Amino acid sequence: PILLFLIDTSASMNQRSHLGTTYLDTAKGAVETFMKLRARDPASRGDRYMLVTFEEPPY
Amino acid sequence: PQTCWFEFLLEESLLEKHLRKPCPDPAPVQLIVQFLEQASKPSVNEQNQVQPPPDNKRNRILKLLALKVAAHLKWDLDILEKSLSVPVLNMLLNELLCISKVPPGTKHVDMDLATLPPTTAMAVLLYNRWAIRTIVQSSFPVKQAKPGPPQLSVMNQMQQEKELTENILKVLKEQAADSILVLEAALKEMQCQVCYDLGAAYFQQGSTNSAVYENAREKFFRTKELIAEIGSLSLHCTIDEKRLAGYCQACDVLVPSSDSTSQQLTPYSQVHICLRSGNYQEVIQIFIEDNLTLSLPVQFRQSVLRELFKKAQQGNEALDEICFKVCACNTVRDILEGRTISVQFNQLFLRPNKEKI
Amino acid sequence: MSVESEQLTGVPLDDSAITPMCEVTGGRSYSVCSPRMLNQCLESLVQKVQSGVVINFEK
Amino acid sequence: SPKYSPTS
Amino acid sequence: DEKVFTKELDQWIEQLNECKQLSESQVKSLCEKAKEILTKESNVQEVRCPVTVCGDVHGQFHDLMELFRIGGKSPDTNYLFMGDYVDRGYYSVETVTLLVALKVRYRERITILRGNHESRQITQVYGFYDECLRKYGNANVWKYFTDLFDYLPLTALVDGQIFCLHGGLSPSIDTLDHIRALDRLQEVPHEGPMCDLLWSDPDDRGGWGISPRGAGYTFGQDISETFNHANGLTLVSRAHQLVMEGYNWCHDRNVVTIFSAPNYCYRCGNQAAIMELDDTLKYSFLQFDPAPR
Amino acid sequence: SLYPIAVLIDELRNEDVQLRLNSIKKLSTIALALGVERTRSELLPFLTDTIYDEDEVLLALAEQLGTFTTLVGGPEYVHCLLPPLESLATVEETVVRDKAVESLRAISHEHSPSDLEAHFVPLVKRLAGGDWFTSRTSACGLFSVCYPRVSSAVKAELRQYFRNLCSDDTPMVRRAAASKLGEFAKVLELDNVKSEIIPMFSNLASDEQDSVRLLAVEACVNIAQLLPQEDLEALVMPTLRQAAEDKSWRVRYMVADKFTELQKAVGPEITKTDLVPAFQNLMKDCEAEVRAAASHKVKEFCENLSADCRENVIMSQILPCIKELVSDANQHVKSALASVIMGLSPILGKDNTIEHLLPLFLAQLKDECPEVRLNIISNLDCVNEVIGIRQLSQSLLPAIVELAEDAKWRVRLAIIEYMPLLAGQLGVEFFDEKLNSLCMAWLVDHVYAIREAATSNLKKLVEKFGKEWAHATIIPKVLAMSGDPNYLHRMTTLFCINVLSEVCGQDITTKHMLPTVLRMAGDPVANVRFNVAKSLQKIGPILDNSTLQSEVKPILEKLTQDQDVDVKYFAQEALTVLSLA
Amino acid sequence: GQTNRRHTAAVPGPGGIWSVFHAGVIGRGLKPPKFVQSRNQQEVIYNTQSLLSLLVHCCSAPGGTECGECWGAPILSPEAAKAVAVTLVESVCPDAAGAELAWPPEEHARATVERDLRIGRRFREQPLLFELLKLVAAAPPALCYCSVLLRGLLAALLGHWEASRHPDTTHSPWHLEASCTLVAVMAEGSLLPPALGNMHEVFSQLAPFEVRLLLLSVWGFLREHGPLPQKFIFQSERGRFIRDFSREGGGEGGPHLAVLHSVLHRNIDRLGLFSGRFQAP
Amino acid sequence: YLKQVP
Ligand SMILES: [Mn+2]
Ligand SMILES: [Mn+2]
């Protein structure tokens, strides 16, 4: 299937947790663990993972 | 070289040669640890059934060899406690009681020690002394080493032995007073050791009760008398004169028997007794003498000042004047060292008069 | 650090403006507070990765 | 030996 | 006492130079003196320039001897080793014995750092334990050296401008005073400030992120920049990652990755480099290739 | 009996392996405490019937049985202890198989001959009849050990069994059979080998596996050393020829390796007949490995070749082939040939080298590769010894200056080591004209080894060229660079002064170097401070006592009074060495 | 308390026709001054006294009642000292996440250790804060309002005493004095029993682990009796608000005093005269 | 790497 990640890049994710880590970095780690689990699934050959930000097109 | 419990199990003069060696490898306490570990290894029945180890002939041989090495080491409770663990001591003294042929389940206070055989008598006595000292060391606060990242098996074994140690400690705490009675009956060098153990147990228990402080005082005075009688010939009695002297200083603070010169003449104890009595003028005189001599601790003086001002809050105004006096003394002392000046002194100094200046 | 220990066995729904559009398109929007239930949310999405048709059902 | 970096 | 002990120490140094390991009693005495001489120094052991600073070693004694030839003898030139010198080296026990002997001989002409590989679990699962059981027969030397690694320091400071360490930065820590307030008398946990200190690594990323090594985080350019402006440091020299040219500059000249164990695991064929800081704080790179055997 | 068995079993079933290893170590003690009859009756069948998963305690009990044979009772009871040894030999791990077969080597060594026959021979025939290739390998090792003490009929039976297991189809027992055949002919007789072994040797050579050809021609060089020339020329000469011109470069590489032992066995006349052409074919083969191997072996082949036609065959065949391999561009073979050609240069001598080998030598020196450069410059000392100093210096002086300052500290070190001979040959004027700057650059060079080598080199120059000339030229250079901000160059100057004070008499030491050293004694750097302390320690016995007691003593007591523990200790050591107090 | 002319005059690495030795710099290099401030401690005592006297005059209500014959000290303004405490909190640490007056646990201290490090560094830089906190101690509720600073200093001291390896306490001179002064501050501010006051006396000869465990007991005791503006009973006799001990249920230290008794009974070697101060509460 | 070493 197609996997798409629309991830906020608003300055709101420049807030940090009690872990000393920003929300943006927490999002990146969550996506990393997600695709690790999706590779644990044998359907990773059919999986495609694309990325979209909040900024203006064409970027 | 390495000689182990299989060699000692098969042949006993091997263990005799090991204890006759000037440098036994391993140490005799390590030999005891190995013997009692082999004896305490549980039985795994073929259905993977965990059970207590049956006391076979090999187990009895291990136990008697451990007891023989302990007799060779002359049952030094200091060495045993410093080198071996509490459940190991518990089962070792239980096996010693069994080989001394005391019936298990019978309370030790029931048997008359004079009627008992002498070896059985010191066996029961050493068991009770071990129980008392084990309770004392349990009460002693021990710092923990730094625990690293988790390793599950070793913490399983440590948690298991810690739970067993806790159960043994609570059993000893339940049976503490009967051990005290047995120790007293035995008191009716080993006498000095028993009397010191009784005094230390009295101090620990009487941390709530000044009557048991008085019992500890009598025990420690008798212990110092036994020390004076025995002298340097104590081949088995090792009691520290400094800790018993501190015990006796505390106990004489608690109970004054007059004759202060043979007793204490320190300004510290004079402040103590004058605070207990109410001779605050003498307290002021001792404080100005301390301003001259620079002996008493500055934090001691500060705590005295705080306690007196708490009394002033409780409602004595003569003590408020004495608070001003001792504040002046502590202030001029702290100037003599050259430290800062207290907000409390300035607060008292807000509205001075001719008398104050 | 959250002094309260999360004894929740499930993922509570969030209160956001993305939530109605998420429900309309057929998704359960998640709000997270700790890494443990973040992993729970992530494995919930991993189990949610399937192929199907979203159909409005009306009696 | 399969890896030089201790990935662990 | 001290004089004859120093002379026998120099004898041990000569034997170690001649590549022969010591006795178990000598190892025990050396470890004892090392405990008594490493307890005093703090977590940020200040080392004063001039100095020669060196990356990973990993028990490659012949390359370490060539590195000594490159950078001068231990009595003359000050040295600073930044960790990983116990694992998968063939003369690894000889290497670490030489390093601790040099430390206890010249306490202040040399200082060593504690890498991630200098811990009980890592040594057990990467074979230093196997090497010492093969050599000395028992595990007494192993437990001595791991107890010593429990006492090795944490980070090095050069003139308040250079921050020397093994792994890298951490979101747990912000300041050198926090590094000081950390307590190092503990084998490294799998999570925590000492952990990501000895397990971090750089990247061109930005922000944080989980490392592929399973321990610690991975920092970014702006993170390193923020750290250096926060504590006034000018350059962070770290040594954990293998590089081919021997050194690398990252984060527009703010992180210096140093590697000084050439031909990694005898097969990678990489070069090695070490820095030397001259007393007016002028840096120079020395590069080399492994010696013939 | 039963209770030591019970404690043995409860020790062996556990989690760790250290307790099992201690059980193996203490098994000898347990058995000697029990008695000989007790262990033979019970403990030996127990250790037969136990199957252990863990190879290290398996290996340990193998060597434990090897040491345990004397406690069992020696040659009367080795028959009793053999069945555990064979049950231990029939296993799945090569290392514990090796321990088992070497324990059987010891057993067959101490075994009485009659019992060795009557029990060991049925055991080795059962091991040969075992279906496992591991059992066949262990058996074929036992065939090698079991030869001498058995009778001639048993020798014939074991010989045909050995031939049968050589004829076995699976290749690992063929490799083991070739290895034990190389070992086997050491005890066999000439008629026996030339009747049975050499035909099956030819079968092993005609086999298809490159590995069995490797170990077969290993057996070939073994039997070539064993046998006289007159029959190996008849029998194994075409076999080693077809092995050499076989397709597999692995065996070509290794017969290039063992070619020197082959020519040593066959004698120089056989080399003059046909080994040199096949050697040319091997070194002109397209493989880098065989080229490197032959290029390595040409030196010892040449010096094992007699001098009757040595220079003739070198000029006619060897040397154009050698310059052909020089023309070959491969890096490894170039470095190897660079080492070996100047290894064999003193065999050719002055005239042959100066006609032929100097241009090739200078080309290899003026090659780009650091490996050929380091090799050629590291053992240049052979052509140094065999070739006149002036001739080689004139031949090398065009290339010395570029080689003096280049990539490798190794080649720089060798140049520094060798150049004072050139300076002594070229006199004061040429060295002063151009090499002086190079010596100073070597002194200020990066590497500490370079610096110390340059210091020893200038020691050689000052003792070759005289004290006053160095006072005129070298001393101002060091005393002028003794003020630069690098403490490393300060260390360089201190080492140079430590040498030049010893060499340079005492007057120049007292009036030139001593004030500079004592004025560097007040440097703020602790390193150069205690290095100056070590310098005074080195220099003190050369002075007179007046200068020492006048000026060295205040400096020494200051270097004791200063705060740093290292410089204070070194100053104390220097003071008690000089005995100034 | 808290160039090109010269370069080319000595440049170019004595080779002249080759490269220079070093391959660059790393910054300015060699941070020059390294200057220590050692003006005086003498009469800085007196400047502290002058400022403290001004604070006392400001915080002192006039009243005019002339309490006592002439010995009764005037009672300071709780409002004024409350203001001083609050603005001192704002001056030191603007952070207020742990400003809930109930004390979070030691695990939460491990979580928020960083603020505690900057608090401790500020305290060591500026020793005036101890005298200001002594004025706070003279105030009844200002301890409750400066609870955050007290928590931070306790956390920093806990960290240092954990990270100490020396068997003697007196190797870190500032830490011992700071711990003694801090425990004296809460003792004078009446959050603790007087035996817990004399804990500051026995600091001097206790071993570091004993001090660490006992200050952890202080943490637990203050956790159970969290300081609050309530329970400070006003008196019509005297404006000094009184917290009546042994009416809070927990009362004395209980297990805390028992652990203290065990510590001193283990360290009877040198603490007998101090056990004679502790006695029975 | 011109060294197969087989
Ligand atoms: Mn490493
Ligand atoms: Mn590392």
DSSP string, chain E: -HHHHHHHHHHHHHHHHTT----HHHHHHHHHHHHHHHSSS-SEEEEPSSEEEE---TT-HHHHHHHHHHH--TTTS-EEE-S--SSS-TTHHHHHHHHHHHHHHSTTTEEE---TTSSHHHHHHHTHHHHHHHHHSSSHHHHHHHHHHTT---EEEETTTEEEESS---SS---HHHHHHS---SPPPSSSHHHHHHH-B--SS-S--B-TTSSSBB--HHHHHHHHHHHT--EEEE--S--SSSEEEETTTTEEEE---SSGGGTS---EEEEEEETTTEEEEEEE-PPP-
Cβ-contact G101, G227 below 8 angstroms: yes
Cross-strand pairs, E275: E53, E285
Q: Chain B within 8 Å of G50 (Cβ-Cβ)? A: no
- Residues paired with residue E248 on neighbouring β-strands, in sequence order: E257
Helix (H, G, I), strand (E, B) or coil at F302: helix
Task: List CB contacts (< 8 A) between F486 and chain G.
Answer: 21
Q: Classify burial at F228, counting beta carbons within 10 Å of its beta carbon; exposed 0-12, middle 13-18, buried 19 or more.
A: exposed
Strand, helix or coil at A16? strand
- Both tokens of F419, joined, read 């150049």
B19 touches B66 (CB < 8 A)? no
Please list the alpha-helical segments (H only) found in chain G. Answer: 4-9, 44-59, 78-92, 106-111, 113-125, 128-138, 142-145, 147-162, 173-188, 194-202, 208-224, 255-266, 272-278
Catalytic residue list contains E62: no
Please state the separation of Cα E277 from the chain's center in Å: 17
Structurally, how many domains does chain F consist of? 1
Give residue for tokens 């324990």: F103
Hey, what amino acid is at F54? E
Close Cβ partners of G250 (under 8 Å, ≥ 6 residues apart): G221, G224, G225
CA distances from E134 to B64, E61, E121, E128 (A): 38, 18, 18, 10
d(CA F377, CA F364) in angstroms, rounded, equals 10
Contacts of G15 in chain F (CB under 8 A): 441, 444
Nearest to B146 among E121, E185, E190 (CB): E185
Q: Is E240 annotated as a binding residue?
A: yes
Q: Is E190 labeled as ligand-binding?
A: no
CA distance F56 to F67: 17
In chain B, DSSP finds a helix count (H) and a strand count (E) of 17, 2
CA neighbor of B9 nearest in space, from B25, B26, B31: B31
d(CA F435, CA F423): 8
User: Residue F215 corresponds to which tokens in the numbers above?
Assistant: 């170990």
Closest approach of A20 to chain E, Cα-based (Å)? 5
Q: Is C46 in a helix, a strand, or coil?
A: helix
Cross-strand pairs, E237: E164, E256
Hey, what are C27's tokens? 């998704």
Residue numbers of E between 42 and 81 with CB closer than 8 Å to F: 50, 69-73, 76-78
Contact E178 G114 (CB under 8 A): yes
Q: What distance in Å separates the CA atoms of residue F439 and residue E193, rounded to the nearest whole number?
A: 52
Give distance in angstroms: CA of A54 to centre of ligand 1: 41
Tokens of F285: 């083969």
* 8 Å CB contact between F425 and F390: yes
Select from D1, D4, D8 the Cβ nearest to the Cβ of E214.
Answer: D8
The Cβ of residue A51 has, within 10 Å, a number of other Cβ atoms equal to 10
**CA F569 vs CA E102, F45, F563, F575: distances in Å:** 16, 68, 10, 10
Q: How many CB atoms lie within 10 A of CB F581?
A: 9
d(CA F291, CA F279): 10
Cα–Cα dist B134/B357, whole Å? 59
Question: Chain A interface, mutation test: which of E169, E191, E205, E210, most A Cβ atoms within 10 Å?
Answer: E210
Whether B57 contacts chain E with CB within 8 A:
no
Lookup result for tokens 């154009």: F320
Active-site option among E117, E190, E229, E251: E117
**Which region holds residue E141: left if phi is over 0, alpha if psi is between -120 and 50, else beta?**
alpha
The kind and range of the H/E element at B50 are strand B49-51
- Are residues E170 and E197 in contact, defined by beta-carbon separation less than 8 angstroms? yes
Distance from CA of G16 to the nearest CA of F (A): 11
Distance CA G214, CA G201 (A): 13
Strand ranges across the sheet with E272-278: E110-112, E79-81, E51-54, E272-278, E282-288
Contacts of C1 in chain A (CB under 8 A): 18
Strand partners for A3: A49
| Three-state secondary-structure class, residue A3 | strand
Take residue G16 and report the two structure tokens written for it: 């002249």
Helix (H, G, I), strand (E, B) or coil at A2: strand
Q: Which residues contact E248 (CB under 8 A, 6 or more apart)?
A: E256, E257
| Coil, strand or helix at F96 | helix
Question: At a CB cut-off of 8 Å and minimum separation 6, what does A9 contact?
Answer: A24, A53, A54, A55
E150 within 8 A of E187, measured Cβ to Cβ: yes
Letter for the amino acid at G239? G
Residue E218 CB burial class (10 angstroms; 0-12, 13-18, ≥19): buried
Q: How far apart are CA B213 and CA B208, in angstroms?
A: 9
Q: Which residue, E154, E142, E127, is CA-closest to E59?
A: E127
Residue carrying structure tokens 């202890």:
F81
Sheet of strand E162-165: strand arrangement: E44-47, E155-158, E162-165, E235-238, E255-258, E247-250
Least Cα separation, residue F483 to chain H (angstroms): 48
* Distance from C-alpha of E253 to C-alpha of E202, rounded to nearest angstrom: 12
Strands (E), A1-59: 2-6, 48-52
- What is the distance in A from the centroid of ligand 2 to the CA of E186? 17
3-state secondary structure at position C14:
coil
- Pairwise CA distance, residues E84 & E58, whole Å: 5
Chain A residues in contact with C53 by the CB 8 A cut-off are none
Tell me how far apart the alpha carbons of residues C10 and B344 are, in angstroms, rounded to a whole number: 59
C-alpha distances in angstroms, F576 versus B305, F528, F579? 61, 20, 5
Q: What are chain E's domains?
A: 6-288 (3.60.21.10)
Amino acid at site F168? D
CA G147 to chain centre: 11
- Number of separate helices (H) and strands (E) present in chain C: 2, 0
The label of the residue with tokens 């059980």 reads F23
Question: C with G: how many residue pairs have Cβ under 8 Å apart?
Answer: 5
Secondary structure element (H or E) that encloses residue B51, with its range: strand B49-51
Residues of C whose CB is below 8 A from A21? none
> Which residues, other chains included, contact F480 with Cβ-Cβ below 8 Å and sequence gap of 6+?
none
Q: Does E215 touch chain D (CB under 8 A)?
A: yes
- Between helices F487-503 and F526-539, what is the axis angle to 10°? 0
Distance E277 CA to ligand 2 centre (A): 23
d(C-alpha B322, C-alpha B343), whole Å: 17
G18·F486 Cβ contact <8 A: no
Sign of the CA dihedral running G164, G165, G166, G168 = positive
Q: Which domain holds residue F528?
A: 2-578
Pairing of strands E155-158, G242-243: unpaired
Determine the Cα–Cα distance for residues G28 and E161; give it in Å rounded to an integer: 9
SS3 C30: strand
* Amino acid residing at B318: A
Q: Which residues contact A5 (CB under 8 A, 6 or more apart)?
A: A31, A49, A50, A51, A52
Backbone angles phi, psi at E258, to 5 degrees: -115, 135
Spatial distance between the Cα atoms of F324 and F317, rounded to a whole number of angstroms = 11
The helix or strand, by DSSP H or E, that contains position G233, with its residue range, turns out to be: strand G232-233
Distance CA(G218)–CA(G281), nearest Å, equals 16
Q: Which of H2, H3, H6 lies closest to F250 in CB terms?
A: H6
What's the angle, vertex CA B299, arms to CA B297 and CA B305, rounded to 5? 110
Give the containing element (helix H, strand E) for F403. helix F389-404
Q: What experiment produced this structure?
A: cryo-EM
Q: Give the residue from G201, G82, G257, G226 showing the smallest Cα distance to G151.
A: G226
What gap in Å lies between CA F25 and CA E138, rounded to an integer? 14
Task: Please calculate the CA angle G157-G161-G164 and round it to the nearest 5 degrees.
Answer: 140
Q: Is the dihedral of CA F326, F328, F333, F334 positive or negative?
A: positive
- E59 C-alpha to ligand 1 centroid (Å): 9
- Cα gap B260→B266, rounded to integer Å: 9
Cβ–Cβ under 8 Å, residues E122 and E87:
yes
The CATH number linked to F387 is 1.25.10.10
Known binder of ligand: residue E159? Answer: no
* CA E200/CA E193 separation, integer angstroms: 10
Q: What's the gap in Å between the CA of G15 and the closest CA on chain E?
A: 17
- From the CA of E57, the nearest ligand is 1
Residue that is written with structure tokens 């603490």 in the block: G271
Q: How many CB atoms lie within 10 A of CB F320?
A: 11
Q: On the CB side of B265, how many CA atoms lie within 13 Å of its CA?
A: 4
Angle at the Cα of F368 (from F364 to F369), degrees rounded to 5? 80
Rounded Cα distance, F339 and F335, in Å: 6
Q: Is F562 exposed, middle or buried (0-12, 13-18, 19+ CB in 10 A)?
A: middle
Cα dihedral F317/F318/F321/F323 (nearest 10): -130
CA angle F310, F312, F317 (to 5 degrees): 100
H/E stretch holding F502 reads helix F487-503
Query: D4 C-alpha vs ligand 1 centroid, how far in Å?
Result: 10
E58 annotated as ligand-binding: yes
Task: Specify burial of residue B337 (Cβ count, 10 A radius: 0-12, 13-18, 19+).
Answer: exposed
Give the pairing of strands A48-52 and B43-45. Answer: unpaired
**Helices G194-202, G255-266: crossing angle, 10 deg rounding:** 30
Q: How far is E126 from chain D (nearest CA, A)?
A: 9
Q: What are the two backbone dihedrals, phi and then psi, of residue B50, each rounded to the nearest 5 degrees?
A: -80, 130
Whole-angstrom distance, CA of residue E80 vs CA of residue E238: 12
Chain E residue nearest residue G155, CA to CA: E181
Ligand nearest to the CA of E166: 2
Whether E248 has a binding-site annotation, put simply, is: no
Q: Please give the Cα distance from E85 to E105 (Å, whole number).
A: 19
Q: What six digits make up the tokens of F481?
A: 């660079």
What's the token pair of residue F3? 């209770």
> Which residues of B fall within a CB distance of 8 Å from G184?
299, 302-303, 306
CB contact under 8 A, E126 and D6: yes
Q: Tell me which long-range contacts F128-132 makes (C-beta under 8 A, separation of at least 24).
A: F128/F161, F128/F164, F128/F165, F130/F90, F132/F90
Of F3, F6, F29, the CB nearest to B7: F29
